Design a protein around this ligand. Sequence first.
Ligand SMILES: CCCCCCCCCCCO[C@@H]1O[C@H](CO)[C@@H](O[C@H]2O[C@H](CO)[C@@H](O)[C@H](O)[C@H]2O)[C@H](O)[C@H]1O
Lengths: 47, 431
Amino acid sequence: PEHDERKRLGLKTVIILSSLYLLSIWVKKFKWAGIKTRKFVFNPPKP
Amino acid sequence: AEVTQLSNGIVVATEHNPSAHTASVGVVFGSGAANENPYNNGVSNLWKNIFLSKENSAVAAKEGLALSSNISRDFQSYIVSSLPGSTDKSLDFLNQSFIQQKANLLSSSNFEATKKSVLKQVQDFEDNDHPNRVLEHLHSTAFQNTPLSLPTRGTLESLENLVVADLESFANNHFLNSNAVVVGTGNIKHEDLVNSIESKNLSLQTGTKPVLKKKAAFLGSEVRLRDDTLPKAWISLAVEGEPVNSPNYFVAKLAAQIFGSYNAFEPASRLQGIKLLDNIQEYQLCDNFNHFSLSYKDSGLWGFSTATRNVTMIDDLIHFTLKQWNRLTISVTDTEVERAKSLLKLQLGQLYESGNPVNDANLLGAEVLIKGSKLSLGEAFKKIDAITVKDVKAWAGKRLWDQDIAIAGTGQIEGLLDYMRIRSDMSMMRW
Ligand SMILES: CCCCCCCCCCCO[C@@H]1O[C@H](CO)[C@@H](O[C@H]2O[C@H](CO)[C@@H](O)[C@H](O)[C@H]2O)[C@H](O)[C@H]1O
């Protein structure tokens, strides 16, 4: 009997979560940008 | 601090001091390390050293003259010191060294030896002067790929690639009349130094204007030089500050004065009225620190440098310092601003009015080369006394609150967290 109401809430839930998911990826990439592009250089120390 | 300036092609500026006992005369050029390239970097430090060459110094010593040369980011100086009366002979040495010794000082024997000297000199600095080496890397990462990033002494790589030709090309483009100011400080009078300059003549290397390029730009970044063999962690951190002639030049300096300097080993230093001290002395987060408001022609750097042996609590040192900085935007108190006013004056006083003529020469030249005349303390003190709590907050709200930072550090910096963690602390959470 909850069918109709179940699907209506499903549409709401899936649009919010899909958005939340894409949003979280963008946000994650931003907070990791400094580490992802971090550069290293080695200069053998003098003994 | 009182100025006097006239011109006749060659711009002359002096500042008499009846209680001097000596006098300094010299030339200052409006070009420093920020006017070099990443490949001829160090050419100025090179000039400084041949001017102070052993040979050249003997020729001055016999004359009762002492030589001095300072290479900075925006300016460059060559000053001669003598007794108050021997001033006539100092100008002769200056004229001789920069309008005749175009190949005397650049001999294969003198050059290769000097080059060899500044090379070991710089190798030592890079090897042992951790606090200054770090501060130099701060400028290097903050203004990367921009004029202001080049180290004043230059890099060992470009230093050892330099030849007499490099020295000459720099001189031909920067040691020009339009990019210089003859300076005289000490007890000598203005309307007397100009005469000895008019006594001679010529115009060798004149009419030409110095070269131009891209302007300095601050970039939020960091350079980490970890070295676990060192006994300390030396770090320097800063936001983009103020350039000379900025409306907030004094406000920024007052802000730095609020957090000041500190030496954990000096009893009186531990007693200063700086709230930050209550947070860092419990667990002794550092051996010392010092705030600064560095100002140059194109941009500035506002921040601090610290040295610490508490390698496991570096996150607290940084956290507490940046948390105090947030206060400048939201809660700095009246008394904190008033204590800063008093001490800024005191520091400006010790800077602009030391008994030293060579210090005043550099300050006079470098300043007239930008604004046209050195600023009097009386006027500086008036601008300082007018700074309100609101001025500080408005300023902090733009240069500090949630703004990009530049970091550099060497030694045992494992405890120095990532960029973002540091960058986050530039603001606070609120409703
Ligand atoms: C368990 C599930 C419950 C989830 C509830 C969701 C919670 C949402 C909280 C949202 C915002 O909370 C808010 O975050 C921003 C940072 O993003 C804070 O901003 C703070 O840092 C930002 C920088 O990133 C600064 O620009 C800003 O001036 C500063 O106040 C703000 O002061 C805070 O109020």
